[PDB]
Amino acid sequence: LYFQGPITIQGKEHFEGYGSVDIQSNPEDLKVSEVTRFNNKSIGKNELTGALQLKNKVSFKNDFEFNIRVANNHQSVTTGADGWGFLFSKGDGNEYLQKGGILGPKGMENSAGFKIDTGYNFKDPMDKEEKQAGQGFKGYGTFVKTGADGTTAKVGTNIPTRGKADNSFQYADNSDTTDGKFHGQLLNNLKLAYNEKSGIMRAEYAGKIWEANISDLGLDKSEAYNFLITSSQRQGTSVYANGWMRTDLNNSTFKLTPN
Ligand SMILES: [Ca+2]
Ligand SMILES: [Ca+2]
Ligand code: NA
Ligand SMILES: [Zn+2]
Ligand SMILES: [Zn+2]
Ligand SMILES: [Zn+2]
């Protein structure tokens, strides 16, 4: 008798791309062989948007751990990309293209995930709560859920080393040696970990930690969800490499039980 156990997969062949997603070979600044690039290819729309949909549905009956290497654009919070949305949903890549994800005020309904927010959108009440308005590289991370009507809301919390919870961090810098600590314009690991026993999804990035319960995210233990890596950018605000959000899927790892 045969039962599907955990798998660990790596590489872009396990994802289908949607919208503004393309390949960049041997990017000189990132020092790896290939990245998947968001917000470069045109899609005939002012709002560039793109998604990588994992071809396997993710079973929440079992643990998973995603280690996703991402690099952020070296660009102002008012010029660059909206950010990264790591998204779980019954919807698919085509629905995301039409309704959005978790990086703005509204998105695909009944979905949830973790966002690295790198852009200031005056229409998003979350960007105002986080004092995102600025001209540098200050962004924030948080788990996010959309309701039945599509509205995004914060879920869970930062787990600070000391003091008060804080979502903010610098998503890029003008460091002056980029070897050692966190420099968000380089490839850095985002760990997305889920423990089916505790019901907790944990995100680790930029030396910070966030947690949310799947009950508060609106995900059910017994369901299986599509997993999407997304980014978007509003054009016309900037310019070479403008808005580029890149991930190295060849050295990213995804451990899960497919379903
Ligand atoms: Ca939907
Ligand atoms: Ca934002
Ligand atoms: Na790098
Ligand atoms: Zn493979
Ligand atoms: Zn720059
Ligand atoms: Zn709602």
Please summarize what this structure is.
It is classed as cell adhesion. This protein is mainly beta and 259 residues long.
Describe the protein in words.
The strands form 2 sheets. Strands 1, 3, 4, 7, 12, 14, 15, 16, 18 and 19 form a 10-stranded antiparallel beta sheet that branches. A hairpin with a 5-residue loop joins strand 10 (138-146) and strand 11. The radius of gyration is 17 Å and the shape is globular. It has helices at 93-99, 125-129, 214-217; strands at residues 7-9, 15-19, 21-25, 34-38, 47-54, 58-59, 64-71, 83-89, 112-117, 138-146, 152-155, 157-158, 168-170, 188-195, 200-205, 208-213, 224-234, 245-247, 253-256. By secondary structure, it is mostly beta strands. It contains 3 helices and 19 strands. The chain has one domain (7-256): Jelly Rolls. 6% of the residues lie in helices and 41% in strands. It is classed as cell adhesion. Keywords: Lectin, sasg. It forms a monomeric assembly.
